[PDB]
């Protein structure tokens, strides 16, 4: 079995307390204690991760942006603040137990449309310039997550065949053999590479297939596996490192 599976088995074996501590050890963490009181305060902690990728040119949203699994709309409102973005369309399932789009008046809200009650697995693909997808339901089973990840990759493939040259797709479980194989074919066809965003907690192995990255998928996945494993069983927990939360400003925008 893979290093990923080993990390997963170990994680699952962790006690409640150990787990809580491990979760944010040496990670990058936003100060959300100000976001909780529009004043350009992002909806969620997902905003910071997209900002991390874009700041480093791993993805450059442009034109018509589609955001699959938009939830409250962190990614959708962020994309609306990008210079070359003209329209942002979000889709999310909503409903009991799930996140509803939160209406904001951060900068470019006038160009953001978010539709709830949409299961994107049954939604026919449409043309976009930039495809964002942040779907992935966790499970202690690597096997279960493998199958979910593959279902999302199959769904993402259909939108990516409509011509977006910019993309950012969450890979819930990048370390399983069948996912690794599918990523390689998808990389061959559409390019990009896998990146580990350091704001992600150590309790998950999520990586982002981003169009501005490149390189050997297996190596990148294995590197993350090892870093995550190296952070377990610490003598002293030093905690997370912080950065300022994103500014989304306010008001309508011209396009
Ligand atoms: N099949 C599906 N169709 C549409 N939305 C789904 C879905 N499966 C899961 N989701 C939704 O996808 C979301 C992913 S979390 C979205 C976070 C967002 N990027 C932000 O920054 O706010 C969850 O809110 C979940 O309800
Ligand atoms: Cl899922
Ligand atoms: Cl996370
Ligand atoms: Cl403007």
Coordinates of C-alpha atoms in Angstrom, one line a residue, residues 8 136-140 144-145 148 172:
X8 CA -4.7 7.5 6.6
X136 CA -14.9 16.0 -2.1
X137 CA -16.7 14.3 0.8
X138 CA -14.2 12.7 3.3
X139 CA -14.3 9.2 4.6
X140 CA -12.0 7.2 6.9
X144 CA -14.4 5.0 -0.4
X145 CA -12.6 8.3 -1.1
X148 CA -15.7 9.4 -4.9
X172 CA -9.9 14.5 -2.2

